[PDB]
Amino acid sequence: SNGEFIPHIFYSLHQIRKDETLTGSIRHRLKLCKSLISENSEWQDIIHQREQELQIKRDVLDDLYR
Amino acid sequence: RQINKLIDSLPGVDVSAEEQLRKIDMLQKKLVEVEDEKIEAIKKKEKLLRHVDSLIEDFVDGIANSKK
């Protein structure tokens, strides 16, 4: 997901933690973050499989030449 | 003049026939030989087609063992 929308919330959150509209805006951005993350070792395994296909075919052509 | 052009355009005739008969026999021999050559060529082409077939079943076995 996008990582540029999170420090914007952290700035105001820092201000509130140091001290309705401020926390209201913070929540208004946090909802957009909720919908964003909701919309958006494992892949390694998958990588190998895809290449497995490529390797078998290369071996066949190499069977023709040799 | 058309008659002169036609009698001059006719194929080369001969007073004897042994030439013609000889030509016929020779042509027969050539026919037999070229037939045999055809047979051989057909055989070789068949062999090659068998080979590239073999390649194709290799590929099919590959993808079959692959995606499923």
GROMACS .gro file of C-alpha atoms in nm:
model
  134
    1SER     CA    1   0.000   0.000   0.000
    2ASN     CA    2   0.092   0.369   0.006
    3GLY     CA    3   0.321   0.473   0.290
    4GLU     CA    4   0.296   0.851   0.241
    5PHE     CA    5  -0.040   0.895   0.420
    6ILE     CA    6   0.080   0.769   0.761
    7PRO     CA    7   0.329   1.037   0.880
    8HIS     CA    8   0.058   1.295   0.806
    9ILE     CA    9  -0.154   1.129   1.074
   10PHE     CA   10   0.143   1.083   1.307
   11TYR     CA   11   0.219   1.456   1.312
   12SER     CA   12  -0.123   1.553   1.450
   13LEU     CA   13  -0.125   1.245   1.675
   14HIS     CA   14   0.204   1.366   1.822
   15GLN     CA   15   0.051   1.709   1.883
   16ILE     CA   16  -0.255   1.559   2.056
   17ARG     CA   17  -0.035   1.335   2.270
   18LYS     CA   18   0.176   1.635   2.376
   19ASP     CA   19  -0.118   1.852   2.487
   20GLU     CA   20  -1.318   1.747   1.839
   21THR     CA   21  -1.199   1.886   1.505
   22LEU     CA   22  -0.836   1.773   1.542
   23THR     CA   23  -0.914   1.414   1.640
   24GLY     CA   24  -1.199   1.436   1.390
   25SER     CA   25  -0.956   1.503   1.107
   26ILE     CA   26  -0.721   1.233   1.237
   27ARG     CA   27  -1.007   0.981   1.224
   28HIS     CA   28  -1.112   1.114   0.882
   29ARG     CA   29  -0.770   1.017   0.748
   30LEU     CA   30  -0.760   0.690   0.945
   31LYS     CA   31  -1.080   0.578   0.772
   32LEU     CA   32  -0.919   0.635   0.432
   33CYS     CA   33  -0.624   0.428   0.554
   34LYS     CA   34  -0.867   0.154   0.660
   35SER     CA   35  -1.026   0.142   0.315
   36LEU     CA   36  -0.681   0.159   0.152
   37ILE     CA   37  -0.526  -0.133   0.340
   38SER     CA   38  -0.858  -0.318   0.309
   39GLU     CA   39  -0.853  -0.284  -0.070
   40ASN     CA   40  -0.487  -0.379  -0.114
   41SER     CA   41   0.842  -1.688   0.199
   42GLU     CA   42   0.508  -1.723   0.020
   43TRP     CA   43   0.600  -1.564  -0.313
   44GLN     CA   44   0.940  -1.738  -0.306
   45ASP     CA   45   0.787  -2.084  -0.343
   46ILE     CA   46   0.571  -1.942  -0.622
   47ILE     CA   47   0.879  -1.796  -0.803
   48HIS     CA   48   1.040  -2.140  -0.821
   49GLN     CA   49   0.731  -2.302  -0.972
   50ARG     CA   50   0.703  -2.054  -1.260
   51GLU     CA   51   1.068  -2.110  -1.342
   52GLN     CA   52   1.009  -2.487  -1.326
   53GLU     CA   53   0.800  -2.459  -1.642
   54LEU     CA   54   1.070  -2.258  -1.817
   55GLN     CA   55   1.339  -2.512  -1.722
   56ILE     CA   56   1.150  -2.815  -1.853
   57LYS     CA   57   1.097  -2.656  -2.194
   58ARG     CA   58   1.463  -2.553  -2.222
   59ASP     CA   59   1.560  -2.914  -2.147
   60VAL     CA   60   1.341  -3.036  -2.434
   61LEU     CA   61   1.506  -2.810  -2.692
   62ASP     CA   62   1.844  -2.917  -2.552
   63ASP     CA   63   1.724  -3.271  -2.620
   64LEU     CA   64   1.685  -3.178  -2.985
   65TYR     CA   65   2.033  -3.028  -3.027
   66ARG     CA   66   2.234  -3.289  -2.835
   67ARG     CA   67   0.381  -1.902  -9.653
   68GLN     CA   68   0.191  -2.049  -9.357
   69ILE     CA   69   0.235  -2.393  -9.514
   70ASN     CA   70   0.608  -2.327  -9.551
   71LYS     CA   71   0.628  -2.218  -9.187
   72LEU     CA   72   0.440  -2.531  -9.079
   73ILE     CA   73   0.648  -2.781  -9.278
   74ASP     CA   74   0.956  -2.606  -9.135
   75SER     CA   75   0.805  -2.611  -8.783
   76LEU     CA   76   0.732  -2.985  -8.778
   77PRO     CA   77   0.954  -3.195  -8.549
   78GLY     CA   78   1.263  -3.360  -8.691
   79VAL     CA   79   1.152  -3.670  -8.880
   80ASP     CA   80   1.384  -3.957  -8.971
   81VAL     CA   81   1.393  -4.216  -9.248
   82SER     CA   82   1.443  -4.496  -8.993
   83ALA     CA   83   1.246  -4.615  -8.691
   84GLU     CA   84   1.514  -4.770  -8.467
   85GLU     CA   85   1.576  -4.420  -8.331
   86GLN     CA   86   1.214  -4.377  -8.220
   87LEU     CA   87   1.185  -4.724  -8.067
   88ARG     CA   88   1.516  -4.674  -7.885
   89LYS     CA   89   1.385  -4.345  -7.745
   90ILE     CA   90   1.068  -4.519  -7.624
   91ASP     CA   91   1.260  -4.794  -7.443
   92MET     CA   92   1.498  -4.544  -7.281
   93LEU     CA   93   1.205  -4.334  -7.158
   94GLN     CA   94   1.052  -4.646  -7.002
   95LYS     CA   95   1.375  -4.720  -6.813
   96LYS     CA   96   1.391  -4.361  -6.686
   97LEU     CA   97   1.030  -4.396  -6.568
   98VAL     CA   98   1.109  -4.704  -6.359
   99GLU     CA   99   1.422  -4.550  -6.206
  100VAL     CA  100   1.256  -4.220  -6.114
  101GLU     CA  101   0.969  -4.415  -5.955
  102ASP     CA  102   1.215  -4.597  -5.728
  103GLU     CA  103   1.384  -4.268  -5.635
  104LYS     CA  104   1.042  -4.128  -5.541
  105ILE     CA  105   0.988  -4.425  -5.308
  106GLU     CA  106   1.318  -4.365  -5.128
  107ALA     CA  107   1.253  -3.992  -5.081
  108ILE     CA  108   0.906  -4.062  -4.939
  109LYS     CA  109   1.059  -4.303  -4.687
  110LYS     CA  110   1.316  -4.049  -4.565
  111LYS     CA  111   1.056  -3.774  -4.526
  112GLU     CA  112   0.840  -4.014  -4.323
  113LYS     CA  113   1.133  -4.076  -4.087
  114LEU     CA  114   1.190  -3.703  -4.030
  115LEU     CA  115   0.820  -3.649  -3.958
  116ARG     CA  116   0.838  -3.928  -3.699
  117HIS     CA  117   1.127  -3.748  -3.527
  118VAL     CA  118   0.961  -3.407  -3.498
  119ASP     CA  119   0.648  -3.584  -3.375
  120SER     CA  120   0.863  -3.731  -3.098
  121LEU     CA  121   0.971  -3.378  -3.006
  122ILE     CA  122   0.606  -3.271  -2.985
  123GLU     CA  123   0.506  -3.547  -2.742
  124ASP     CA  124   0.802  -3.438  -2.532
  125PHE     CA  125   0.657  -3.086  -2.511
  126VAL     CA  126   0.305  -3.215  -2.439
  127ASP     CA  127   0.437  -3.430  -2.154
  128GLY     CA  128   0.612  -3.119  -2.023
  129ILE     CA  129   0.311  -2.887  -2.007
  130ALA     CA  130   0.089  -3.174  -1.891
  131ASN     CA  131   0.317  -3.243  -1.595
  132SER     CA  132   0.334  -2.865  -1.545
  133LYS     CA  133   0.020  -2.656  -1.507
  134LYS     CA  134  -0.230  -2.899  -1.352
   0.00000   0.00000   0.00000
